[PDB]
């Protein structure tokens, strides 16, 4: 009916409060902070063996294993130290857009255009990987999956919704429906009580896995959002968009802090991850290479150019001793 | 050197061998999209096969294995997942010749998006004009000017069909590295698979020549 009137009124007073909170700027504060200096990484191992484009990775908690999803229908679990493979899971649907690694190491998630989140069980009496549950009820295509523990998972589909599942009973237990475009990224907070989701509506939302309803939204981009990641402490999150720009917010202040841009890049961002200390902000562009940003000085720091196609995914180990980037060149490079 | 890491690398080599022997077997099949605008008979084209989400259909004709990926239940923004089908051999398109009730331009608009897309610069587009019987039964007591007022031609099945085929064909903006095969099927025709087979083998010859460098 007329509900749009009070909707926009609440939006406007929200903006007013946001203006009331901006009493300082990161640019003003970082006046005298030493630049991080030019870092120079290099390929250490090359994890070849895929036969098509790679769409996602995720590091284990031990910082030695990693799982990569491709369109060849395979879900390889590598061993980053010695490059020899461990498992090769053949999927029932070759179209995969995401993968995940449970913190305990027992389970691996994988979903795609089939919009069924299949949880794969690794450690069993018999020695082959089996699929445990097939989570369904989504009406779109899965974009990202993350494990809270061995019993709970959260998905994000193109049906403009994100949902918290329950692996045991296989029933949706809380649906987050306040968004308005195709969701394409998730990032659980380290304390595992609240997560964000950046989507095609040029807006990022942070939820509350208990109340099951968004607590604050962010609107600062000119186009769709492709990757999110929580800042390690748990009070910030970086974003990537198609408009060659990454942005870093903070939650307790509900504002923006810095914007990373350069006139020499007109490509899009595909994945964003932080370092252990938060001083470095990795971001995998689709102009055939990754970039390294100083999350405070806003200037470019390093370049990771070793691929022959779009960089489609990257991640940083828990111990902070490595970074891994995947690309549509069917390869998977690990840096140090 | 190793204690049983030798056994570990042996397992790695074995599953690498399995990955090749599976990739070489999944690379023999030829892949096809199956798009469509609305109620166009993509269901009927599927029903001419021999033997939620994305539904697949596998069938073999004359010792050639096919795969037809059907989307359309995936009601979402195309630009996010259309880049997954980059290496498909062809895109079997389907429109409805009896589309004057639509409240056809939507199909005509859609064809422009997928034929001139940035990921399909070198992918042939088989085009299936459907419901020719309905066209014949309908144009006898109606103008074609409803879809195109500026059209200046007779009101007869052959002329109308030729004009509409040309009208879809000229939307192609990259006339050099593509090809738009066209066919006028009906709900009773039984050579649609044969036409698809001919188109796919022609595209295979094209790709082999362009790889060998002659083309």
């Amino acid at each position: 009916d007329q509900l749009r009137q009070e909707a926009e009124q609440l939006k406007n007073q929200i903006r007013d409060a946001r203006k009331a909170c901006a009493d300082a700027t990161l640019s003003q504060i970082t006046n005298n902070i030493d630049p991080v200096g030019r870092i120079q990484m290099r390929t250490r191992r090359t994890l070849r063996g895929h036969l098509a484009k790679i769409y996602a990775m995720h590091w284990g908690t031990d910082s030695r294993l990693l799982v990569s999803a491709s369109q060849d229908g395979k879900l390889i679990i590598w061993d980053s130290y010695t490059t020899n493979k461990v498992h090769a899971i053949p999927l029932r649907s070759s179209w995969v857009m995401t993968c995940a690694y449970a913190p305990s190491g027992n389970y691996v998630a994988c979903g795609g255009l089939d919009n069924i989140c299949s949880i794969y069980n690794l450690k069993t009496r018999e020695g082959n990987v089996r699929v445990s549950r097939e989570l369904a009820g989504h009406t779109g295509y899965l974009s990202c999956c993350r494990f809270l523990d061995d019993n709970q998972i959260v998905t994000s589909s193109g049906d403009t919704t994100c949902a918290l599942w329950d692996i045991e009973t296989g029933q949706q237990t809380t649906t987050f429906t306040g968004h308005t475009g195709d969701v394409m990224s998730l990032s659980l907070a380290p304390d595992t009580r609240l997560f964000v989701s950046g989507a095609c509506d040029a807006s990022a939302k942070l939820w509350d896995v208990r109340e099951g309803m968004c607590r604050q939204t962010f609107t600062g981009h000119e186009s769709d959002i492709n990757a999110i990641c929580f800042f390690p402490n748990g009070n910030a999150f970086a974003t990537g968009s198609d408009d060659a720009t990454c942005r870093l917010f903070d939650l307790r202040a509900d504002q923006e802090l810095m914007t990373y841009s350069h006139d020499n890049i007109i490509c899009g961002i595909t994945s964003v991850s932080f370092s252990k200390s938060g001083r470095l902000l990795l971001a995998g562009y689709d102009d055939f290479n990754c970039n390294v940003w100083d999350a405070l000085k806003a200037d470019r720091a390093g370049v990771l150019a070793g691929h022959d196609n779009r960089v489609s995914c990257l991640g940083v180990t828990d111990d902070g001793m490595a970074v891994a980037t995947g690309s549509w060149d069917s390869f998977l490079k690990i840096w140090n | 050197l190793s204690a049983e890491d030798k056994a570990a690398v042996e397992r790695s080599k074995m599953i690498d061998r399995n990955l090749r022997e599976d990739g070489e077997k999944a690379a023999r099949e030829v892949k096809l999209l199956l798009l469509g605008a609305g109620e166009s008979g993509k269901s009927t084209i599927v029903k001419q096969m021999k033997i939620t989400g994305i539904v697949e259909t596998h069938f073999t004709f004359k010792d050639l294995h096919f795969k037809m990926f059907d989307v359309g239940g995936q009601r979402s923004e195309r630009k996010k997942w259309i880049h997954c089908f980059e290496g498909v051999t062809a895109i079997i398109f389907c429109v409805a010749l009896s589309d004057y009730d639509l409240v056809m331009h939507e199909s005509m608009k859609l064809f422009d998006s997928i034929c001139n897309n940035k990921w399909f610069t070198d992918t042939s587009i088989i085009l299936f004009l459907n419901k020719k019987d309905l066209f014949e039964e309908k144009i006898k007591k109606s103008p074609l000017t409803i879809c195109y007022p500026e059209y200046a031609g007779s009101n007869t099945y052959e002329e109308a069909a030729a004009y509409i085929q040309c009208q879809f064909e000229d939307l192609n903006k990259r006339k050099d590295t593509k090809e738009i095969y066209t066919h006028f099927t009906c709900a009773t025709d039984t050579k649609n698979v044969q036409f698809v087979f001919d188109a796919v083998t022609d595209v295979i010859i094209k790709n082999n020549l362009k790889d060998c460098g002659l083309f």
């Epitope: 461990v86 018999e126 020695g127 | 204690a3 030798k6 056994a7 570990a8 042996e10």
Partner: single-chain antibody, 231 residues
């Protein structure tokens, strides 16, 4: 999860026999399998081995040449061939599986066993025969190797085994530290380089038996003499 073997009986010296192990209940093709023996009132001694896919095969020096071993994946069966049976071979033969990848648990499962009656390397010495105990208090068992088992890669290759009276042995801990599945979280293991210790926290009635030490670094797999926790 279910291995049963057959082929035993009585043989004449210098003769021949075939041994078969029927695998039913797991992915046989991706598991390597071994063969270990037990002379009466004696310990364990490694015999043979096949890697997954029959890629690599090793043997034991005392049975080299006159034993040949092979497997048939589609039928899920393990074959061991007896030729020229000597006299120091009367033993009850076991059928043990093992898979090798990062974080795996080799020697997970052990078959029942069959009796075959015929009428320079690593050395492990547990140096103890029997320790008397009562239910309730802790107890420790020691093991000693010839050379340091700590491979430079980072992990130490020492296994521990348990054998209830009249039963097939099972695995307690692997890599000196990690517990095995289905084992109560009251065992433990420790040590460094050459000295090794196993510590039961609070004994129970179902723990009396003989415990065996075993290395895996050099490939000839020598076992221990045998330690009995006869209550």
């Amino acid at each position: 999860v279910q291995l049963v073997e057959s082929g035993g009986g009585l043989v004449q010296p210098g003769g021949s026999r075939k041994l078969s192990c029927s695998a039913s209940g797991f992915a046989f093709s991706s598991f390597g399998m071994h063969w270990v023996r037990q002379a009466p009132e004696k310990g364990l001694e490694w015999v043979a081995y096949i890697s997954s896919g029959s890629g690599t095969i090793y043997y034991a020096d005392t049975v080299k040449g006159r034993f040949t071993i092979s497997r048939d994946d589609p039928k899920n069966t393990l074959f061991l061939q007896m030729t020229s049976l000597r006299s120091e071979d009367t033993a009850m033969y076991y059928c043990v599986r093992s898979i090798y990848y990062y974080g795996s648990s080799p020697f997970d499962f052990w078959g029942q066993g069959t009796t075959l009656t015929v009428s320079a390397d690593i050395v492990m010495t547990q140096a103890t025969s029997s320790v008397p105990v009562t239910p309730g208090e802790s107890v420790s068992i020691s093991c000693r190797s010839s050379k340091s088992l700590l491979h430079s890669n980072g992990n130490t290759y020492l296994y521990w085994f348990l054998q209830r009276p009249g039963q097939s042995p099972q695995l307690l801990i692997y890599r000196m530290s990690n517990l095995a599945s289905g084992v109560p979280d009251r065992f433990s293991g420790s040590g460094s380089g050459t000295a090794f210790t196993l510590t039961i926290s609070r004994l129970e009635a179902e723990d009396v038996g003989v415990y065996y030490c075993m290395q895996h670094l050099e490939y000839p797999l020598t076992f221990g003499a045998g330690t009995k926790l006869e209550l």
